[PDB]
Design a protein around this ligand. Structure first.
Ligand SMILES: O=C(NCCCNc1nc(Nc2cccc(CN3CCOCC3)c2)ncc1C1CC1)C1CCC1
Ligand SMILES: O=C(NCCCNc1nc(Nc2cccc(CN3CCOCC3)c2)ncc1C1CC1)C1CCC1
Lengths: 626, 626
């Protein structure tokens, strides 16, 4: 074998991790402890030979300590070549680029993981600003990832400060492509990339020979837009000031994220934010807590980004901006019961919200049932070419699509299981509004009983005009009360099991966790992703043996069969059942809004008559005489 | 390289899978399709040379098709040696032994996974009984595992019917060690092993030289017992007719599983079940559905194994047998509201129960708060010896213990999060019993109002004895009603936030999912299990190089530090917080049982007076005259 060594460290040249322009990164261990470290060996060191200036540049990075920055442990010299070797912190998981290489993140990172990336990157750059050093060359490849003690990812920076001695091509500022504006540029490109899984500004044949057109895209500067992609060869550029539909981010977050990118992605130094403005808006998002809310009327889940110190007034406002529901009509349901929120109640004392257990929202005004809005992405055509590079690229693509389909499928199941809960709670919450009307009826019933037989007694002792008038008046009330008594039993007949309102259809329509459709999709998805990582190990081998050449061709054909089998099961089973559940949901809503309209009126026809039987009890029942 | 071939198949000798006495199993592919198959090459074929009798014995296994049986595809001859090669179905996951090799199953398989094992093994043997063939040599190594289309494991048999041409040593029947009784023996040993993670009958130094004592254990035949283990060298045998505390199986299942094993684990052919009796009891368990129930009083979760055709009467009975709660006192809570079950309601129409969303049970009779009962298992002492075999054995042991601690930790968090829900539901369910008392009070209030001022009017028109008597009687009621009116406000003061009953302590005591204690435990557990599988790759290498020898020693010492760090965090954080939550839970229960006792009496002091004000309204209020 072949491996370099040091006074305290040693490493094989086969354990290469990073191939830079100035230095190379190797997986190395310590001679004594055996603990793994990152070995940064300086290549091309001869025309410089610094032992005075650069030495102190390494003595400053040593004491530089932060959670969002890869730690530099020591500066040692190679045994033979006497090259300056940096003992860096080893990150077993890799970088942000490695994460984006996964098909599960082909259409953007998970929302929770994205918030971690945002939090760490901002914290890292801010710490570098405190020391004055500017990075600019901030790429997902320069953002390492480690697993913290709590299992959550922690992102760190590393490849910075190499501008004094010497941005990435797809992360270059237009004026830099030819202040701190050029630094904040690549950050937005990184942030968009992490949220989309794709670059913001893409030509047709990629950023290579057609990258001459790519510079025209950036210099085009459409201000508010954050995406410039041509869907055809040397055609027009499709602009967009919003994020793709395939984005895995919630609607609440996109509203806050969009203006951040738009104000850091333009050539104008007068329209672009500074690091203070950038830090302010970013820190604002990171501080906010999440309130899970599922609108039963629209069959849509929502994530309201609000501060803990904000009141319920702003909460109802934010819900309206995402659901188009007036605050005075936003009726809340939680944990099976109705939930009343005070206009000035802080967000710290809000109930425990989860994607699986949120705060349902029901309204009285008619709302169209929308459901989940996603992008219909079909499988890409697989070419019979043997191109190992192309076989690895298309493997990442075709697997990412199925990942998206499996992502939507689990969400479609989420919406249905959430629907069954909200409906089950609602019908029982309606019964609560039925039991109160009964108790608000019996109070009127007893009232007339001690008003009828009290005036029927006064006249049976044996004037007549007043007697007959009240008698007729009380009869027109006890009768009108009689029909309401019966019509409420009709409502109770509706609330009864199998009473044209029961949720028997909800358990007999869409898909259920018993079907295990997501697990079935994952099985095929595992078969594909296994082949994918294998094709990565085939691309690195440049060429394969005859035996491995055939296996590569076999698995490539089985990659299509796996994807096709999964895509069929998704549309013909998961989707179709969802369409059926969505249909009978919009029907039951109308039948429910109609009922609540009845019960409301029938209840209001008890309060107005409660005041009518109050102006008679204090009248003839109590005459006057010395 | 070195690899054998066939007319249609080929395989490397390095891809060995099974090392049997008669044949070897290799990972092989097809020459055309490239699909992977299991290659069974016959070793020691010379003194037999069968081409007539044995050929048909392979022609019968070909048409033999079942889900719980490994499929035999074809019978081909080797190119050079002309050995009889069986093209078997390849099982990438391995066998049941492979599953038990995992530290996560060191103390038994998960309950769901165990039910799959039971279901498949029974279905497999039953199919073999239909064909008449008996296996007897049923070992976890002879039970393969594959992943079905729905993601769930599927277990199959394979190494059977090799008795005609020719049980495992730890799976031998006592009379066989020296009817179909000898067949059902190894099944119970397998079933115990899967549920415990350990053999039922173990000497001290293992089943080797001290296995002479092991035969004394089996021939000891304590009938009802199912375990025989000596904790000391050549000491007494500790018998047990029940399963260990570390068993991951629910209490409901153990009650059904115990008699099954006890009746198939004894030398007596008169006390042992037949295959019909065995199939009946096993199929009975597999057909039953699971009802999740969490007793708030005892802070214990329960899994009631009941049939779908059974009524709620048997349900309440089964709950009593596990919670010691009388059926007439079992008050049910579900989905935030109280749940009323009809005595003859089928189990098919029971609500959706989950371990995370079960049916809570509250009682009126005082119950001691038990909580989770588990076995306190400490880390085993690690010896400084270099023994690779011993280093791999202790790695499986020390990792399995931490797995158990992480298993309990997630359960301790489950019980607490379940506690917070049941309490939150209860306090709101009490308010429901408070709002009814109010409505059952106002009916009495209005009653006396039209009874007081109706008799105060009759006497103010200006006999006297009757007048004064009723007046005093109504005063003793309106007054006694007045104090109840105020004492209920005291209860409402208790139900009010911060009213010596609020669940503010529940969110400020034990551990929460925000702490991520389980994730923290998993991080260290991942570091350990990685080292474990590495030690397996070191044991197979017999000896290691100098470099790898030191790394082995380094990771071995870091294996202790990982386990110690995890075990400390478990006891000092996860456990201690659980003890505090358990303490303040037992206190709040008494304060809740006391309140419900008050509200009950205060409610009963409204019904008995409702009938008192009913015998006066139909009296003097309605006199008599012509
Ligand atoms: O600082 C740079 N590159 C960063 C990307 C590669 N460098 C590293 N990679 C890693 N880990 C890593 C990189 C790529 C893939 C993986 C995942 N596997 C781990 C071991 O097995 C193979 C890959 C791990 N750790 C630390 C570092 C150095 C300290 C910043 C510049 C590029 C040359 C210097
Ligand atoms: O039938 C037997 N042995 C069963 C155990 C090994 N045989 C098999 N193993 C397997 N798969 C397997 C066995 C052990 C480990 C693993 C997991 N990895 C898969 C590939 O990489 C290494 C191990 C897989 N499939 C099929 C079979 C034969 C058809 C029953 C007798 C023992 C000689 C015949």
């Amino acid at each position: 074998a072949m491996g370099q060594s040091t006074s305290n460290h040693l490493w094989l040249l086969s354990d290469i991790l990073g191939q830079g322009a100035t230095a190379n990164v190797f997986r190395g261990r310590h001679k004594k402890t055996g603990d793994l470290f990152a070995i940064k060996v300086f290549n091309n060191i001869s025309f410089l030979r610094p032992v005075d200036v650069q030495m102190r540049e390494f003595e400053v990075l040593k004491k530089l300590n932060h959670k969002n920055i890869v730690k530099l442990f020591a500066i040692e010299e190679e045994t033979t070549t006497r090259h300056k070797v940096l003992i860096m912190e080893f990150c077993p998981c890799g970088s942000l680029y490695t994460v984006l290489e996964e098909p599960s993140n082909a259409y953007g990172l998970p929302e929770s993981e994205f918030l971690i990336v945002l939090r760490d990157v901002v914290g890292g750059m801010n710490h570098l600003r405190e020391n004055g050093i500017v990075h600019r060359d901030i790429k997902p490849g320069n953002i390492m990832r480690v697993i913290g003690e709590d299992g959550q990812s922690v992102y760190k920076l590393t490849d910075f400060g190499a501008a004094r001695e010497l941005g990435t091509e797809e992360y270059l500022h237009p004026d830099m492509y030819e202040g701190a504006t050029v630094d904040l540029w690549s950050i937005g490109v990184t942030f968009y990339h992490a949220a989309t899984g794709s670059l913001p500004f893409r030509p047709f044949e990629g950023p290579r020979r057609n990258k001459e057109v790519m510079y025209k895209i950036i210099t085009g500067k459409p201000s508010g837009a954050i995406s410039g992609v041509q869907k055809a060869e040397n055609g027009p550029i499709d602009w967009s000031g919003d994020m793709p539909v395939s984005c895995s981010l919630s609607r609440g977050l996109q509203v806050l994220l969009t203006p951040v990118l738009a104000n850091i992605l333009e050539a104008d130094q007068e329209k672009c934010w500074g690091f203070d403005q950038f830090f302010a808006e970013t820190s604002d998002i990171l501080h906010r807590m999440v309130i899970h809310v599922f609108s039963l009327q629209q069959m849509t889940a929502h994530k309201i980004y609000i501060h803990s110190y904000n009141t319920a007034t702003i909460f109802h406002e934010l819900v309206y901006k995402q659901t188009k529901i007036i605050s005075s009509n936003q009726e809340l349901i939680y944990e099976g019961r109705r939930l009343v929120l005070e206009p000035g109640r802080l967000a710290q004392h809000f109930p425990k919200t989860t994607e699986e257990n949120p705060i349902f929202v029901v309204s009285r005004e008619p709302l169209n049932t929308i459901g989940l809005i996603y992008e219909k992405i079909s499988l890409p055509k697989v070419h019979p070419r043997y191109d190992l590079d192309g076989d690895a690229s298309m493997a990442k693509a075709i697997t990412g699509v199925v990942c998206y389909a499996c992502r939507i499928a689990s969400t479609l199941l989420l919406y249905q299981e959430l629907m069954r809960k909200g409906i089950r709670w609602l019908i029982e919450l309606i019964k609560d509004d039925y039991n109160e009307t009964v108790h608000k009826k019996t109070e009127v019933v007893i009232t007339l009983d001690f008003c009828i037989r009290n005036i029927e007694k006064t006249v049976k002792v044996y004037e007549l005009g007043e007697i007959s008038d009240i008698h007729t008046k009380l009869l027109r009330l006890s009768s009108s009360q009689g029909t309401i008594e019966t019509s409420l039993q009709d409502i109770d007949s509706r609330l009864s099991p199998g009473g044209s309102l029961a949720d028997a259809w909800a358990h007999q329509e869409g898909t259920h966790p018993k079907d295990r459709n997501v697990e079935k999709l994952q099985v095929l998805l595992n078969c594909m992703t296994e082949i994918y990582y294998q094709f990565k190990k085939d691309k690195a081998e440049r060429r394969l043996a005859y035996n491995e050449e055939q296996i590569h061709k076999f698995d490539k054909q089985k990659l299509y069969y796996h994807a096709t089998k999964a895509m069929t099961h998704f549309t013909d089973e998961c989707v179709k059942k969802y369409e059926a559940f969505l249909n009978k949901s919009e029907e039951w809503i109308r039948k429910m809004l109609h009922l609540r309209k009845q019960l409301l009126s029938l209840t209001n026809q008890c309060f107005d008559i409660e005041e009518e039987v109050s102006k008679y009890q204090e009248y003839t029942n109590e005459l006057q005489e010395t």
